[PDB]
Every structure is written in structure tokens, then in C-alpha cells.
Design a protein around this ligand. Structure first.
Ligand SMILES: CC(=O)N[C@@H]1[C@@H](O)[C@H](O[C@@H]2O[C@H](CO)[C@H](O)[C@H](O)[C@H]2NC(C)=O)[C@@H](CO)O[C@@H]1O
Ligand SMILES: [Cl-]
Length: 138
């Protein structure tokens, strides 16, 4: 198992047709998982499954600029389950990050950070056993 939190360098940032794949298993009684696509200290795309926000499960997505979180985008469709293996695929498209979980489309997140080639790290954190994190150009 990879050590969490895990940093995956994205050399030269991201670009349309880059596909990032995260394989792992949610811990029992998980609280949160997070993917942070970072541009330096900024977070271009934060993808944050929350397993117990007021006894509901929700995915919170956002951007952090100059240390300030912006307007959250919330998705109530929640494909993760404590104790179970998952696959997250993040496909960079011209206008958005497109996320599928377990081969089913989940959400899109419009690019707020415009300098895609400066989004050069992916941080993976939270209540998972992390099996692998990789990228490929499709
Ligand atoms: C309903 C609502 O607006 N809740 C927010 C809450 O989600 C937010 O918590 C932060 O949210 C960002 C994403 O927007 C990250 O997930 C942060 O990790 C998370 N910070 C903490 C300490 O959990 C807080 C703080 O911005 O403000 C509202 O409560
Ligand atoms: Cl930008």
C-alpha cells in the first residue's frame, strides 16, 4: 500500500486527454477522502467525499485560491462505500475535469484555474488504503 497522504507529480501540469487513475479501498468507518489537484499552494480541483456530514454522504468539490476556498459544488450521488475497493478516473477535458468512479460517470468540475500546465501535483489523502495512483494520455 502507498503511504497516505501521497503526492503524485504531474509533470508540466495537466492537459486535455490526460487521464489520472486512483485505485484504493475505503477504510472501515471512513470519514473523508480527498483528491487535491494543486497549482503551487492553490488547489485547482478539490474532490472531497464526506461520509458523515450531518449523517449524510456528499461529495464536496471546490477550488482554493490564495488560501481561500471558493463556492462549493456538491454532488449527492455517492458511489463510495466504507470497506470497499474503488477506482477514481479523472479525465482532463478542455472545459472541465470529468470524474468517473467504478466506470460510471459521477460529475464534472469546470476549470476555475486556467493555467492547466501549472497544476503540477495531485495530493491524495484521507481514510483509504491507497493501491496505486497513475496517469496516461488517451
Ligand atoms: C455547508 C458549508 O458550506 N460547509 C463549509 C465547509 O465545507 C468548509 O470546510 C472546508 O471545505 C473545503 C471545501 O470547500 C475543504 O473540504 C476543507 O478541507 C474544509 N475544511 C475543514 C476544516 O473541514 C468550512 C471551512 O471552509 O466552511 C463551511 O463550514
Ligand atoms: Cl490561472
Amino acid at each position: 500500500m502507498l503511504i497516505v497522504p501521497y503526492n503524485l507529480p504531474l509533470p508540466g501540469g495537466v492537459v486535455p486527454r490526460m487521464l489520472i487513475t486512483i485505485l484504493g479501498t475505503v477504510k472501515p468507518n471512513a470519514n473523508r477522502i480527498a483528491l487535491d489537484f494543486q497549482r503551487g499552494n492553490d488547489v485547482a480541483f478539490h474532490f472531497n467525499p464526506r461520509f458523515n456530514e450531518n449523517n449524510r454522504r456528499v461529495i464536496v468539490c471546490n477550488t482554493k485560491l490564495d488560501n481561500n476556498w471558493g463556492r462549493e459544488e456538491r454532488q449527492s450521488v455517492f458511489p463510495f462505500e466504507s470497506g470497499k475497493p474503488f477506482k477514481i478516473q479523472v479525465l482532463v477535458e478542455p472545459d472541465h475535469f470529468k470524474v468517473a468512479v467504478n466506470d460510471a460517470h459521477l460529475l464534472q468540475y469546470n476549470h476555475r484555474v486556467k493555467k492547466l500546465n501549472e497544476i503540477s501535483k495531485l495530493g491524495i489523502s484521507g481514510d483509504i488504503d491507497l493501491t496505486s495512483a497513475s496517469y496516461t494520455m488517451i
